[PDB]
mmCIF file of C-alpha atoms and ligand atoms in Angstrom:
data_model
loop_
_atom_site.group_PDB
_atom_site.id
_atom_site.type_symbol
_atom_site.label_atom_id
_atom_site.label_comp_id
_atom_site.label_asym_id
_atom_site.label_seq_id
_atom_site.Cartn_x
_atom_site.Cartn_y
_atom_site.Cartn_z
ATOM 1 C CA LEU A 1 -24.095 22.448 54.347
ATOM 2 C CA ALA A 2 -26.424 24.307 56.704
ATOM 3 C CA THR A 3 -29.812 22.763 55.881
ATOM 4 C CA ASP A 4 -31.151 19.234 56.011
ATOM 5 C CA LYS A 5 -31.611 19.457 52.236
ATOM 6 C CA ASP A 6 -27.913 20.197 51.730
ATOM 7 C CA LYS A 7 -26.830 17.496 54.182
ATOM 8 C CA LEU A 8 -29.011 14.851 52.516
ATOM 9 C CA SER A 9 -27.815 15.850 49.055
ATOM 10 C CA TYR A 10 -24.213 15.600 50.242
ATOM 11 C CA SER A 11 -24.705 12.218 51.904
ATOM 12 C CA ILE A 12 -26.271 10.786 48.748
ATOM 13 C CA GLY A 13 -23.430 12.164 46.634
ATOM 14 C CA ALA A 14 -20.842 10.665 48.985
ATOM 15 C CA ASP A 15 -22.581 7.281 48.917
ATOM 16 C CA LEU A 16 -22.604 7.415 45.114
ATOM 17 C CA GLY A 17 -18.986 8.553 44.927
ATOM 18 C CA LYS A 18 -17.812 5.751 47.206
ATOM 19 C CA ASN A 19 -19.676 3.171 45.111
ATOM 20 C CA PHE A 20 -18.255 4.560 41.860
ATOM 21 C CA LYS A 21 -14.710 4.732 43.243
ATOM 22 C CA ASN A 22 -15.053 1.173 44.542
ATOM 23 C CA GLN A 23 -15.890 0.007 40.999
ATOM 24 C CA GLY A 24 -13.290 2.057 39.132
ATOM 25 C CA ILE A 25 -15.954 4.211 37.459
ATOM 26 C CA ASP A 26 -14.336 7.457 36.274
ATOM 27 C CA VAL A 27 -17.032 10.113 36.680
ATOM 28 C CA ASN A 28 -17.190 13.893 36.356
ATOM 29 C CA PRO A 29 -19.341 15.172 39.256
ATOM 30 C CA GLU A 30 -19.916 18.596 37.676
ATOM 31 C CA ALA A 31 -21.260 17.140 34.423
ATOM 32 C CA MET A 32 -23.429 14.801 36.478
ATOM 33 C CA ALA A 33 -24.766 17.639 38.620
ATOM 34 C CA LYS A 34 -25.706 19.502 35.432
ATOM 35 C CA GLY A 35 -27.656 16.567 34.014
ATOM 36 C CA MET A 36 -29.371 16.129 37.361
ATOM 37 C CA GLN A 37 -30.318 19.812 37.472
ATOM 38 C CA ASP A 38 -31.594 19.728 33.881
ATOM 39 C CA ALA A 39 -33.780 16.700 34.591
ATOM 40 C CA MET A 40 -35.289 18.330 37.678
ATOM 41 C CA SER A 41 -35.858 21.843 36.319
ATOM 42 C CA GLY A 42 -37.661 20.467 33.268
ATOM 43 C CA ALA A 43 -35.090 21.901 30.876
ATOM 44 C CA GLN A 44 -33.971 20.583 27.504
ATOM 45 C CA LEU A 45 -31.435 17.840 28.169
ATOM 46 C CA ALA A 46 -28.085 18.359 26.460
ATOM 47 C CA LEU A 47 -28.384 14.823 25.032
ATOM 48 C CA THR A 48 -31.286 13.198 23.238
ATOM 49 C CA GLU A 49 -33.252 10.329 24.762
ATOM 50 C CA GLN A 50 -31.322 8.006 22.441
ATOM 51 C CA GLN A 51 -27.799 9.337 22.954
ATOM 52 C CA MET A 52 -28.277 8.808 26.689
ATOM 53 C CA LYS A 53 -29.790 5.339 26.328
ATOM 54 C CA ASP A 54 -26.892 4.339 24.074
ATOM 55 C CA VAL A 55 -24.447 5.826 26.595
ATOM 56 C CA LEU A 56 -25.903 3.951 29.563
ATOM 57 C CA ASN A 57 -26.216 0.615 27.729
ATOM 58 C CA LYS A 58 -22.585 0.845 26.638
ATOM 59 C CA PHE A 59 -21.966 1.650 30.304
ATOM 60 C CA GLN A 60 -23.714 -1.435 31.670
ATOM 61 C CA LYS A 61 -22.155 -3.715 29.049
ATOM 62 C CA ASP A 62 -18.654 -2.529 29.954
ATOM 63 C CA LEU A 63 -19.443 -3.036 33.646
ATOM 64 C CA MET A 64 -20.635 -6.630 33.209
ATOM 65 C CA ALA A 65 -17.597 -7.460 31.072
ATOM 66 C CA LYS A 66 -15.359 -5.974 33.778
ATOM 67 C CA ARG A 67 -17.206 -7.863 36.512
ATOM 68 C CA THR A 68 -17.123 -11.088 34.498
ATOM 69 C CA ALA A 69 -13.390 -10.797 33.854
ATOM 70 C CA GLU A 70 -12.755 -10.265 37.574
ATOM 71 C CA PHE A 71 -14.833 -13.333 38.392
ATOM 72 C CA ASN A 72 -13.020 -15.556 35.890
ATOM 73 C CA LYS A 73 -9.645 -14.244 37.052
ATOM 74 C CA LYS A 74 -10.554 -15.014 40.665
ATOM 75 C CA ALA A 75 -12.018 -18.403 39.713
ATOM 76 C CA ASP A 76 -8.803 -19.344 37.911
ATOM 77 C CA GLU A 77 -6.598 -17.987 40.703
ATOM 78 C CA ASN A 78 -8.441 -20.066 43.296
ATOM 79 C CA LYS A 79 -8.351 -23.208 41.141
ATOM 80 C CA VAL A 80 -4.594 -22.837 40.668
ATOM 81 C CA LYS A 81 -3.968 -22.364 44.389
ATOM 82 C CA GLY A 82 -6.287 -25.264 45.173
ATOM 83 C CA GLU A 83 -4.510 -27.671 42.839
ATOM 84 C CA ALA A 84 -1.178 -26.489 44.246
ATOM 85 C CA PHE A 85 -2.371 -27.050 47.808
ATOM 86 C CA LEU A 86 -3.720 -30.529 47.088
ATOM 87 C CA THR A 87 -0.637 -31.591 45.117
ATOM 88 C CA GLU A 88 1.545 -30.714 48.114
ATOM 89 C CA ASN A 89 -0.855 -32.205 50.639
ATOM 90 C CA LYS A 90 -1.014 -35.654 49.035
ATOM 91 C CA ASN A 91 2.620 -36.195 50.058
ATOM 92 C CA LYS A 92 2.142 -35.502 53.769
ATOM 93 C CA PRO A 93 2.027 -38.146 56.518
ATOM 94 C CA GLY A 94 -1.329 -39.834 56.954
ATOM 95 C CA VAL A 95 -2.919 -38.257 53.882
ATOM 96 C CA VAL A 96 -5.006 -40.627 51.751
ATOM 97 C CA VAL A 97 -6.173 -39.655 48.249
ATOM 98 C CA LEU A 98 -9.512 -41.082 47.051
ATOM 99 C CA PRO A 99 -10.651 -41.565 43.445
ATOM 100 C CA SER A 100 -12.802 -38.420 43.453
ATOM 101 C CA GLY A 101 -9.803 -36.308 44.471
ATOM 102 C CA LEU A 102 -11.022 -35.955 48.039
ATOM 103 C CA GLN A 103 -8.161 -36.305 50.495
ATOM 104 C CA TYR A 104 -8.312 -37.051 54.183
ATOM 105 C CA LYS A 105 -6.210 -37.703 57.254
ATOM 106 C CA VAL A 106 -7.444 -39.685 60.252
ATOM 107 C CA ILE A 107 -6.818 -37.832 63.494
ATOM 108 C CA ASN A 108 -8.686 -40.403 65.561
ATOM 109 C CA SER A 109 -10.478 -43.576 64.525
ATOM 110 C CA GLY A 110 -13.867 -44.348 66.029
ATOM 111 C CA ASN A 111 -15.365 -47.799 66.435
ATOM 112 C CA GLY A 112 -18.997 -47.108 65.523
ATOM 113 C CA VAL A 113 -20.861 -47.643 62.276
ATOM 114 C CA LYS A 114 -20.275 -45.867 58.953
ATOM 115 C CA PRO A 115 -23.316 -43.825 57.851
ATOM 116 C CA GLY A 116 -25.151 -44.648 54.648
ATOM 117 C CA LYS A 117 -26.431 -42.271 51.989
ATOM 118 C CA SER A 118 -29.869 -42.005 53.630
ATOM 119 C CA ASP A 119 -28.784 -41.794 57.273
ATOM 120 C CA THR A 120 -28.584 -38.618 59.351
ATOM 121 C CA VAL A 121 -25.411 -37.757 61.248
ATOM 122 C CA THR A 122 -24.544 -35.543 64.198
ATOM 123 C CA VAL A 123 -21.124 -33.896 63.897
ATOM 124 C CA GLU A 124 -18.893 -31.179 65.370
ATOM 125 C CA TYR A 125 -16.736 -29.433 62.750
ATOM 126 C CA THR A 126 -14.610 -26.521 61.577
ATOM 127 C CA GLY A 127 -14.366 -25.426 57.962
ATOM 128 C CA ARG A 128 -11.525 -23.208 56.738
ATOM 129 C CA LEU A 129 -9.928 -21.920 53.560
ATOM 130 C CA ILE A 130 -6.389 -22.694 52.456
ATOM 131 C CA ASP A 131 -5.197 -19.448 54.086
ATOM 132 C CA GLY A 132 -6.607 -20.460 57.478
ATOM 133 C CA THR A 133 -9.741 -18.326 57.322
ATOM 134 C CA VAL A 134 -12.451 -20.148 59.271
ATOM 135 C CA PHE A 135 -15.813 -19.752 57.526
ATOM 136 C CA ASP A 136 -17.933 -22.032 59.731
ATOM 137 C CA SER A 137 -17.824 -24.114 62.890
ATOM 138 C CA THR A 138 -20.072 -25.787 65.446
ATOM 139 C CA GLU A 139 -17.740 -24.438 68.148
ATOM 140 C CA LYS A 140 -19.602 -21.105 68.228
ATOM 141 C CA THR A 141 -23.062 -22.621 68.696
ATOM 142 C CA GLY A 142 -21.284 -24.930 71.159
ATOM 143 C CA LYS A 143 -23.734 -27.540 69.890
ATOM 144 C CA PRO A 144 -23.430 -30.461 67.453
ATOM 145 C CA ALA A 145 -24.924 -29.964 64.003
ATOM 146 C CA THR A 146 -27.170 -32.521 62.313
ATOM 147 C CA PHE A 147 -27.261 -33.335 58.612
ATOM 148 C CA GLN A 148 -28.646 -35.878 56.187
ATOM 149 C CA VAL A 149 -25.686 -37.529 54.477
ATOM 150 C CA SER A 150 -27.129 -36.863 51.017
ATOM 151 C CA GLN A 151 -27.873 -33.167 51.671
ATOM 152 C CA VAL A 152 -24.342 -31.811 52.224
ATOM 153 C CA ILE A 153 -21.615 -30.901 49.750
ATOM 154 C CA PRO A 154 -20.272 -33.929 47.837
ATOM 155 C CA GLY A 155 -16.953 -33.936 49.696
ATOM 156 C CA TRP A 156 -18.820 -34.507 52.954
ATOM 157 C CA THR A 157 -21.054 -37.163 51.395
ATOM 158 C CA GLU A 158 -18.005 -39.123 50.218
ATOM 159 C CA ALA A 159 -16.115 -38.673 53.494
ATOM 160 C CA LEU A 160 -18.978 -39.511 55.845
ATOM 161 C CA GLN A 161 -19.653 -42.892 54.235
ATOM 162 C CA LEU A 162 -16.069 -43.905 55.104
ATOM 163 C CA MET A 163 -16.111 -42.595 58.680
ATOM 164 C CA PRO A 164 -16.893 -44.824 61.682
ATOM 165 C CA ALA A 165 -18.987 -43.053 64.273
ATOM 166 C CA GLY A 166 -16.727 -41.603 66.949
ATOM 167 C CA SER A 167 -14.026 -40.730 64.420
ATOM 168 C CA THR A 168 -12.322 -37.394 63.831
ATOM 169 C CA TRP A 169 -10.927 -36.697 60.371
ATOM 170 C CA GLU A 170 -9.429 -33.779 58.500
ATOM 171 C CA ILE A 171 -10.665 -33.677 54.919
ATOM 172 C CA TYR A 172 -9.383 -31.652 51.986
ATOM 173 C CA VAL A 173 -12.096 -30.937 49.479
ATOM 174 C CA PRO A 174 -11.504 -29.970 45.830
ATOM 175 C CA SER A 175 -13.841 -27.207 44.718
ATOM 176 C CA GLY A 176 -15.731 -29.587 42.433
ATOM 177 C CA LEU A 177 -16.778 -31.456 45.595
ATOM 178 C CA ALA A 178 -17.718 -28.227 47.405
ATOM 179 C CA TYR A 179 -19.317 -25.142 45.833
ATOM 180 C CA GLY A 180 -17.513 -25.203 42.488
ATOM 181 C CA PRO A 181 -17.370 -22.078 40.316
ATOM 182 C CA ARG A 182 -19.807 -19.991 42.425
ATOM 183 C CA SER A 183 -19.738 -16.719 44.393
ATOM 184 C CA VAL A 184 -22.740 -15.235 46.266
ATOM 185 C CA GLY A 185 -20.172 -12.781 47.705
ATOM 186 C CA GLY A 186 -20.016 -14.939 50.863
ATOM 187 C CA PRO A 187 -16.873 -16.153 52.672
ATOM 188 C CA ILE A 188 -16.293 -18.770 49.899
ATOM 189 C CA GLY A 189 -15.276 -17.497 46.484
ATOM 190 C CA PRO A 190 -15.243 -19.425 43.216
ATOM 191 C CA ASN A 191 -13.340 -22.691 42.793
ATOM 192 C CA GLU A 192 -12.233 -22.752 46.418
ATOM 193 C CA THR A 193 -10.681 -25.849 47.949
ATOM 194 C CA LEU A 194 -11.950 -26.284 51.503
ATOM 195 C CA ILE A 195 -10.452 -27.927 54.584
ATOM 196 C CA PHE A 196 -12.682 -29.418 57.266
ATOM 197 C CA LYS A 197 -12.020 -31.002 60.637
ATOM 198 C CA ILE A 198 -15.016 -33.286 61.180
ATOM 199 C CA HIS A 199 -15.837 -35.254 64.346
ATOM 200 C CA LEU A 200 -18.668 -37.767 63.695
ATOM 201 C CA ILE A 201 -20.600 -38.287 66.921
ATOM 202 C CA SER A 202 -23.547 -40.440 65.893
ATOM 203 C CA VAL A 203 -25.355 -42.117 62.992
ATOM 204 C CA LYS A 204 -29.140 -42.405 62.687
ATOM 205 C CA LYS A 205 -30.725 -44.746 60.133
HETATM 206 ZN ZN1 LIG B 1 -18.204 -41.486 45.088
#
């Protein structure tokens, strides 16, 4: 690895190898080097245009199926844990279960007004997963957040309309009232039940 050409080639290969290994793709680097050399020298490829196209389409299809099965398995695993968590939590002191499946516990009751669907609210909050992983919070920005009541996840919309201004609640949000069966790879996987501590500061008609 003395030249910049060798170092670049190696770095690309290592990036590829790490990506393949991370996806469980069993690959033969020598056979791949040979096909790469053949393509670049202008030689006759050891496979026809069609054999290769068939090979790579079978490859993609298997990958999607594998990725889909991992999604569904994770979606089901999170649903199961969520239902387990909520079934245990409904028994605990102070926990109220609402018709939509949203649960909450009043930590402190305010005396202000309850926001309506159209109002805007200012709130402090922390959102966490069932394992305690915090995925968001106003306590980094050290500044209240502001939201229209109708433009947040349904669990918040249902909770806020019950909350007097000044109140602090913990709410326990079934995935159907949060982000449902979705994963953009972010901190929230599919069918995740969420827990929020929400302090409602003010309501704005
Ligand atoms: Zn409702």
